[PDB]
Design a protein around this ligand. Structure first.
Ligand SMILES: CC(C)CC(CC(C)C)O[C@@H]1O[C@H](CO)[C@@H](O[C@H]2O[C@@H](CO)[C@@H](O)[C@H](O)[C@@H]2O)[C@H](O)[C@H]1O
Ligand SMILES: [Zn+2]
Ligand SMILES: [Zn+2]
Lengths: 159, 160
């Protein structure tokens, strides 16, 4: 529980649903977000990086009726495809590639979902519950889409 | 205003993934604590809450803690969030699943069901902390989209 250095990188952007969000940063700071017209006003202590940056750290201690609605313009995302398994997705233009996986031969859907179904987008967590991400395997591993296997680095087949 | 028993949300009773202290608020106003160790949750709450008496834990937008439900495979119906604010109802018969309802006509959903823990709601029990309001489910004369193909409501999912 250390100020600034313990701090989770928080979300800043459009939210869906209006009302009050609350969370606790890993430093110990309680952060309040007031969401009105999709836009969040942050209230926090000056002991937390999130207060300075206008951001809201989403995690297992987040409460409130709203959810992030991120822009579809991300570079990388973490996508939870099984109970404790993740795939990393890299976007280039309108195309999406699996550039990493937590375990060899993860089964994933052939199409990326909308950005708010991602557990993380560019290092920012979007989901309240998320299991720990094991080390991402980025070489000589394969993912499954139905009955077809593809080497890491491969575009998702439904494009 | 929250009323003992009448306001109470239907809570989860089952296996939990992760160990630690879970915390939630029932719509009746009760604060429910769950101590989770080795898959099992110990429920603490007031005599005023239907969840305390059933030994259940209501999962909602005011739930906190490091654990998630691991629901049982023998569920009948489930709510599956297939788009940002759209749901499909899934009915399970044997090892086979059917889309028996949808919140909007022509919803695009995946061709395969995920494991039960990825469902928003299983047999009237909410499993996720954040979930959008479910619109009335359309059960007659609607279709869903898997890629380019259309399927009528009641149809089995493509991949099985
Ligand atoms: C389907 C059940 C039996 C699985 C079992 C999990 C454990 C054995 C891993 O779940 C526990 O069952 C007991 C009731 O005995 C509940 O206390 C009231 C717990 O809240 C619940 O977490
Ligand atoms: Zn902080
Ligand atoms: Zn209650």
């Amino acid at each position: 529980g250390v100020p600034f250095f313990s701090c989770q990188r928080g979300y800043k952007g459009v939210w869906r649903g209006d009302g009050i969000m609350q969370t606790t940063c890993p430093c110990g700071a309680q952060i309040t977000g007031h969401v009105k017209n999709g836009s969040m006003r942050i209230v926090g202590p000056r002991t937390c990086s999130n207060t300075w940056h206008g951001t809201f750290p989403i995690n297992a201690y987040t409460t409130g009726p709203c959810t992030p609605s991120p822009a579809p313009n991300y570079s990388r995302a973490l996508w939870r495809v099984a109970a404790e398994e993740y795939v990393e997705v890299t976007r280039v233009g309108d195309f999406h590639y699996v550039t990493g996986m937590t375990t060899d031969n993860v089964k994933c859907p052939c199409q990326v979902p909308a950005p708010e179904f991602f557990t993380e987008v560019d290092g920012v967590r979007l989901h309240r519950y998320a299991p720990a991400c094991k080390p991402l395997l980025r070489e000589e591993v394969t993912f499954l889409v139905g009955l077809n296997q593809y080497l890491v680095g491969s575009q998702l087949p439904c494009e």
